[PDB]
Amino acid sequence: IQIREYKRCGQDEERVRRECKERGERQNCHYVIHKEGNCYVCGIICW
Ligand SMILES: [Zn+2]
Ligand SMILES: [Zn+2]
């Protein structure tokens, strides 16, 4: 099992969330989005 994190700050929430979902989809893995204020961590989990 693997997890990679990608952080983005200063960007629009909907667009950052969409980037993450599509990242997970392209990789055929799973995503989560963890929000702290204006910063977002995209976690991509692959088995
Ligand atoms: Zn899976
Ligand atoms: Zn969270």
Side-chain angles (χ1 to χ4, degrees):
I1 192 172
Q2 173 194 268
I3 180 148
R4 299 249 165 76
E5 291 177 289
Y6 313 85
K7 187 154 77 187
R8 317 273 270 191
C9 296
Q11 320 250 47
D12 175 90
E13 179 170 9
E14 187 173 12
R15 287 165 73 184
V16 173
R17 288 176 60 83
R18 193 165 71 229
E19 174 182 33
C20 191
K21 313 183 181 184
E22 295 292 316
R23 173 173 286 120
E25 177 175 21
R26 171 177 61 92
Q27 300 186 7
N28 286 309
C29 298
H30 301 260
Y31 77 92
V32 295
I33 275 277
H34 166 74
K35 160 183 177 65
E36 303 194 11
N38 181 224
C39 292
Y40 298 89
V41 186
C42 173
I44 301 294
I45 309 97
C46 308
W47 275 262

